[PDB]
Paper text:
To discover the real conformation of these non-homologous regions, as well as determine the catalytic site residues, we have solved the crystal structure of MZ0003 to 1.9 Å.
The overall topology of MZ0003 reveals the presence of three large inserts, referred to as regions 1, 2 and 3, which do not have counterparts in either of the fungal homologs. Together, regions 1 and 2 form a subdomain at the N-terminal end of the central β-sheet, with the helices of region 2 on the same side as the catalytic residues and the loops of region 2 protruding over the active site and partially occluding it. The relatively occluded access to the catalytic residues, suggests that MZ0003 may act on smaller or fragmented substrates rather than the intact LCC polymers that are the proposed target of the fungal enzymes. The geometric arrangement in the active site indicates that Asp 332 is the third residue of the triad in MZ0003, functioning to adjust the basic character of His 343. This was confirmed as the Asp332Ala mutant of MZ0003 is inactive in assays with both p-nitrophenyl acetate (p-NP acetate) and methyl 4-O-methyl-D-glucopyranuronate (data not shown). None of the six cysteine residues of MZ0003, which are all found in the conserved core regions of the protein, are involved in disulphide bonds in the crystal structure.
Numbering used by the authors: 4 to 103, 106 to 402
Amino acid sequence: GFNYDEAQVPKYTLPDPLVMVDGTKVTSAKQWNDKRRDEVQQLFEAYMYGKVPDGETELIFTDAKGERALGGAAIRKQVKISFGEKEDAPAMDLLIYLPAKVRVPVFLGLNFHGNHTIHKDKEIWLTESWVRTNKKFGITKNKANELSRGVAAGRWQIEKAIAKGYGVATIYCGDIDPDFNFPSNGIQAYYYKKDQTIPEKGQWGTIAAWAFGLSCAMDYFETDTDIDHKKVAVLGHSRLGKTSLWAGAIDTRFALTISNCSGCGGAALSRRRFGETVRRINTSFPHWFCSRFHQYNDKEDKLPIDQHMLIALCAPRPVLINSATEDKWADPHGEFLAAQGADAVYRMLGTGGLDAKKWPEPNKLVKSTIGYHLRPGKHDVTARDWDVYIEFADHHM
């Protein structure tokens, strides 16, 4: 069964970010940047998240207008980003609030229930993608409707961000790939996956698909002269924080990466086997990871990576790991210990790494280049978490 007792955590050895797979010591920044970093990213692709397929991405952006809002406090934009010219064209909606002088720094993340859930604003478009039922937010049908406008606003503290000089941007994860809570292995998809350059075992990832979505949103930001595309912080909660951590890791355009209660296969060290384990996450969510990751059920000690090496991928750029005290499922101590295990790479690249020896006491940000915060209470995104995000962003961005 699952363990929530620190005293029962097994002994383990972590692979060393600073040792090449061939056994050569990594002794310089140059060597990390030229050889090891890409090697570590290729291990994550092949064993855990899967690789984004090659061949060009033909994004099309709507209008990008800009309307006063939050009377007004802010400009709102909604942009439809389509993948190609045909019917239908996967498409996703990007909702952006910016403060109403210079190119605006922005927090960008995926949401769980639709753009219209992040603020009451009646102008937000209602997604047509499938949505999950959710008791806490009173969502009882799988087609989005206006009754849930604003219900997840607590997780997106727009008014708070705006007052501090940041914009907020968001996309519903289900416009990218729905993450159904029921099994669907249709035959067409079974057959499409065989005729592929990447073999099935190494193909993306729900998580990797969602992370690609976020990089497509950075492509848009590059075209928008009201947004500072060099100061975008990518953030995410829970399964969407596993995503944000990966996206920020591999897309070096993001200035700052935030993982909020991302737990197993996100910030938490897999070898600790505390709370959620690899077998459990792959059993519950067989499409989230590449199928090669399934071979490491109950065998976390044979993984060629662990999540300290993911956090190290973000180096030199700032990364914040936020945990919640009651969120034992996520292994908050393991999330801290992963951050600690990237410290040497970040020091090699000339930054402060993680300024903490012991797992810190709750509710005080460690604000070093690798940041860590342990927030009292439940697995969630709260007003306090946003204060932390902004305190970190104000220091680094």
